[model samples]
Target chain A: TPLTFVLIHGSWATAGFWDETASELRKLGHTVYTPEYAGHGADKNNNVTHEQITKSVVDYIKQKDLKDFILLGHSFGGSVIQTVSQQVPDRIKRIVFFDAFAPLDGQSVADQFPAESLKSFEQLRDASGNNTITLPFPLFRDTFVNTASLAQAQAFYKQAPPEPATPLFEKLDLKKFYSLQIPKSYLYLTEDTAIPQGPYGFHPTQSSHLGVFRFIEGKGDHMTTVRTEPKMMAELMVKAGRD
Target chain B: PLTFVLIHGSWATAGFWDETASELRKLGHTVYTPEYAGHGADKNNNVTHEQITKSVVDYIKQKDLKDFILLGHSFGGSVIQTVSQQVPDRIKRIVFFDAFAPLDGQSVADQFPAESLKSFEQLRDASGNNTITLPFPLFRDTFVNTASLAQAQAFYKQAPPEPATPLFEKLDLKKFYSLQIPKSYLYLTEDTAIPQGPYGFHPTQSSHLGVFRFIEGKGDHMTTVRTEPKMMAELMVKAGRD
Candidate 1:
């Protein structure tokens, strides 16, 4: 069966970020849709709120009439999926969180990030002359793309862009998301120790928030190995997807 | 001298167990240390763990021993093949306590830690003979390292430098890996001779058994089996009988 995938990108990224992944998933004969939020991509808005970004995706799904699909949200996208599920709960097949940030009801995206991350993001915003946040390439390279080589790191960085600032600040109401017993799974890329799982880490930590899900473990840091080994990700996705 | 189905290593002997077997008979176990084609006082050193296994197989068949707990240790675990092959009906059970159970076609040398193999190759080349012997330092640090200073010396005294040819020789274990033999693994925790866990002995080594009873004791490669024979005797019975 051809399963449809709605891939929502995370903070500091645009819809095109999932170009390679979408192409690969399509190669498996599955339908893939990468949707951009209000403050991301061609949205051209810097002062948008979390409700606006959530509405953009919620509206996009209704606009496309996309139904019975796997809703995958990565990093900050986890929270986005949680909120969007409320608007269109009947459309999603399963929710998969990939080493992504997940916050509870009335909690902003910043509420879920680690203390060190909050400090860095705060400093980056203060220094963002245009009210937008830009992650320094080195910080991104080590933390996000540590598994990649110097050359690959440079290639992935070439597509980097500034992200709008407000969705991160909005507190959400996800009480409905907690009550929804949608089949969900969390794919933790083990080498993603860039964001430690302690106090708040992946797997048994943030992933534990999902309450119950199948665990599939593999080698590779957060991002580098994804480029070097896409098949591993594909395998994990399939393992997470299949009955 | 005894009806010893003597299985020698690529370096040492069926006579390797000679001294111990002599002691076993003193306790009336009817020790049969038969020197087969690949082993003995002066035999062809060119052989495999399987060839050594064959020798013991023929020995038991030629003499027709009805019931025996076919025991194998170190390289001799490789011997379970020929011994168990010919008269599995006559056998009681197989015990591999800190021994090598070559996964189909592997050699006894594969069981040695990497460093041990490097030194064995060096010694085999230097001697220009198809034989390899462990230098006392490496042997003391590895094989019998678990023994006390005095016990280590005593055990080392009994270990002859082994043969080189058989260690690297691979065997065709078409039947062994699939054999449904009721087995037990008597692990000696501190023995560094065979690194530990994931790559170590026990579960990783024994997991291949598909099903096995585990018997653990505190000892090393060779000494504890002798110096602490009472403990070994009890564990062996648990492993052998149960």
Candidate 2:
């Protein structure tokens, strides 16, 4: 069946980040919505709260009257999707966390981060006096786009922009999210080095947080598949979102 | 693109690859499954690592299988290490399919996480026949995690009790490590049988392949070969390619 997907980008990227993949999703006769949240995309504010980030998505859904859509979030977008689901659970057909963070009640995204990584992010945030975190090309290349060629990785890093810092470290009150019985799916890209692949990693680690969700695994790093293999990602998304 | 000598893991035999081999064959790849010591037709419950390796070595040599992709699963990964050591010139690539790739001087058991090691030891100790019989609960949760309870139980029933000593014994992988056969790691992502952390199957065990091709798929450790044999053969072909 042709599906409806609301694609939410993670930290350090804009709604335009979903352009290629959303195009592919649309090509498959699916309706795709890319929502730009506060502190991301063209909003330009780096001081938005986690609640503000989530509220913007809630606002987008309310404005669009987007019901029965498969809500998919990548990275920090996972947290947004969680809270968004809490506010609008009945509207969502299902939620798919694509190598994204799923913070438990009262836990921040920082809580799931590896210790050294948390330190690194905090240092980068502190270094940016305005409280925005822009990943260095090397840092982005190695973690986010490891599978891409040096040329492709550099090109990807160029498109990446500064992201809000406060929202990521803020603890999300997700009690209502856990209470909701929305159907869930976790799409894992096996070679994702963005978050280490262990206790704090994306797939079994964060994915496990959504009790009894469907799992779909594929080959790609954290970000390469989104850019390099949009068709494959689109098909996987369909599988995740489909009944 | 090439011939393959598929090796089965502990508690499983050559028949484990029956469906996969046929599927590979349908896709025009030559595939062979060799029954090794203490496994399958060889009812001997007690066997050494060398004896296991020798069984596979003889299978390859006697059949005159040459320049074939040597694919190993679980315990078979360790055997492939030794098998490649003896016949490095014959293998085109060594594919570790969610398999153990123990470092030199380390036993297969050595690569297991501490918590996992305790569970493994407990199973081995509780077995009366010097073989480790998996209780249904542990097997269901890890080995064939994605399967239905009935499917998992059926798969469990088909698995024989794995021999004990060879698993615990340290392998002399000096020559195996030195043997520079082209290698690859085909990780089925849901393989909780080996767990998915620090010493988990994918990076931890797969990293030991050094410079190797990496292929992954959506399936668990045991049942994927039966559940998705077509995909399994396709991935093997992908990993086995030059």
Candidate 3:
């Protein structure tokens, strides 16, 4: 069955992150849309709020008139989709979170990380005059693109820029998002350590936020799989979104 | 990578590994599935955990199996812990497939969810023999969750009554922990057989093997062995390798 997908990339990532995956979906006879949120892509400002980011995606869907389609988010995009669906609940056939942060109601994405890491992020945010957070190369290489080779990790890091800190620190009102009864799914990359693997982990910790959801999991890391294993990621999304 | 000894978990027999073993063989690896004392046509449901581990240890000695990858699943994980201590030099890397690696002096039952453990005790006491029976519903929902009804029923039929003593026994893994053997853990993401909580298989249980390689894959506890043997076997090799 041919389906439409609205793919949202994670933090420090651009719309181009979904190009290979969208192409693969296209070959499989599916329509794909990669929406750029505020403070990302061509919008270089790093001082945007979570509301602006949410509105940016919501505006894209409204502009394109996309309806009854799968809204898929990766990494930080999960939090965006939660609120995005609240704005256009009827338009989403299903919402899929792939190794993403589904932040709890009244919680910011910053609240998801451990105290030490949160401290580091706070320092970075304070140090940067523009209030942006740039990930250290070592942290990105080891945790984000863990399975990638040194070359792959280094190359991928080159494409990454400082992410907006306002959205990360801003607490989200997810009561409306939680109340919405849209079908939800969590597509997990089993080896994804980007969010840390223990109590602060993505799978049971963040993925379990949907309460009742379709659980689809396979192999790969948080970042590398998006580029190297586009086909597997696309196929996993189908399994996650399909009824 | 070359040689593997696949150990099946509770309520299962050596034949449970036929598909996985076959797939490993196809990938140019020699595999052995040792039938323990209480399983595989043995009507005696009255075997201890020590006896079960002894059977595997003796099998290795008899077969002259040396420097082979010892892979354990579910209950078999406990068995390999003790077996590796008995024949530590004969083993290469010990792989746990969503298996338990209980801390020292903790019974396998201790690792089980409190409610599941209570229910297991009730079933074991009711058995009259020293074995515990798995209800079809529990087995279906937790074990072979991904299998179709037909496939689930077929797999359930193969599940013999599990020995009660081994699960309830407190294992002395002091030596098992001290042994400087390489270890690996392969986690099947959808395996709800062990439940996905603080006691969940991956980080909670797999974390016991400190400094071991961690490999994750797709599948539930039992369905992957039957439904996707080739994929499961390939992951087993990945976990087994240096």
Candidate 4:
């Protein structure tokens, strides 16, 4: 069955990350929307909060009047989807968290990161005048795109910009988001180390936060496979999004 | 360009790697999948971890295999650690695919959680032959979740009862750690055969190696070999390469 998809990308990435994936999804006869949130994709304001980002996506959906759509979030976008559900619960059909962070009520996205990673992000945020967090090339190459070749990793690094810092640290009130009974799914990218793959992994640790979500697993890392293997990700997304 | 020595996991034999070996050979690489003691048709139920490692070491010695990438899966992971110690100079590198990595003085059972240990204990006690026959439902859902119900049943039919002795035996891998052979860990993403939390196969098992390359793909523990051998073969090549 054909369905509408709203893809919300994570930090350091614009909605542009879903270009290949959205195209692939469209090829399969699904309506796809890649909404650029606040503090990203030439928004100019790098000091936006998480609420502003969620509002941007919510506003875009309202402007399009997109209803009964599959609302999918990747990485940082997970938190956004939670709040978006509170404001426009009736519009979404189901929520899919693609290797995303599902922060608890009143917890910030930064709280979900590993201790060492949180510390590193804090240092990076401080270094950037408490505005944006720039990822180091070595860390980005080995961790985010571990499966990609050296050349591929270098190319991917060019597309990502500095992620805003304030949003990551914002405490979210997800009581309503959690209270509403909405079908959910967690599409895990198996080799994702963007958050490090231990107790801090995207799977059981973060996916478990969803309480009850369909389990959909796939190959590839945090970033590379979405572009490199769009067809596979698209297929997995269908499996995750569909009934 | 590379020679690979593939080790099969529990309840499986050398035949498990037939499709994978064919794929590897097609890619112009040499591959060997050897059946260890107490596995396959070997009826000797009483075998230690050392005997399993010795059998693999003897196979390499007899074949005069040199500079090959030694690869292990699941239970085979523990075997390779001891095997690497016995034949360190003969191995070019070690690759562990969702396998166990026992510490210097720990047993394979030590790596598993208490719940798993209790479950295994029950399975072993039930089998008078000291083997653990996997339940169909558990194997179907966890080990081969990606496969259809029919495929899972078909794959489960081929599984032999795994000897339970070696899994509980302690292994001394101090030499395996000190050896300077390059290492790689290839992870299968959908694998739920092992518990995912805290005891995951990737960082938890892979992190044991001081420094190693990481390769990952999508497949469950047992069924991917029968269904996605070509994709698994490609990832193994990436992991085995310099």
- Best candidate per DockQ, number? 4
Candidate 3: the clashing residue pairs are none
* Candidate 1 chain A minimal-lDDT segment of 10 residues: A208-217
Please provide TM-scores, in order, for all candidate models, with all chains considered together: 0.51, 0.60, 0.62, 0.66
* DockQ pick, better of 1 and 2: 2
Q: How should the candidates be ordered by lDDT, best one leading?
A: 4, 3, 2, 1
What's the ranking of the predictions by DockQ, best on top? 4, 3, 2, 1
Q: Which pairs in model 4 have colliding backbones? A: none
Every model's DockQ, to 2 decimals?
0.02, 0.09, 0.15, 0.24
lDDT scores of the candidates, listed in order: 0.68, 0.87, 0.87, 0.88
Q: Model 1, range B1-242, lDDT digits (tens) per residue? A: 11223233333455556555655555545655566555556555565555565667776877887656666666666676546765678776677767777777677677666765676688878877666666665565456644444666766666765666656777667666556767777787645455443445676667756677799877667666566665665566667664
Lowest-scoring 10 consecutive residues by lDDT in candidate 4 chain B? B209-218
Which order, best to worst by TM-score? Answer: 4, 3, 2, 1
DockQ head-to-head 3 vs 4, winner = 4
lDDT of 3 by residue, B1-242 (tens): 48999999998999889998999999999999989988897766778999999999999999999989999999999999999999998998899998989989998899987778889899999989878889876676568755665787899899988878999999999999998889999998888777676778977998888899999887888888988999998899889987
**lDDT of candidate 4 at residue B24, scale 0 to 100:** 91
Superposed Cα deviation of residue A137, candidate 3 (Å): 3.2
TM-score of candidate 2 on Cα atoms, chains taken together: 0.60
True contacts kept of each: 0.00, 0.07, 0.21, 0.33
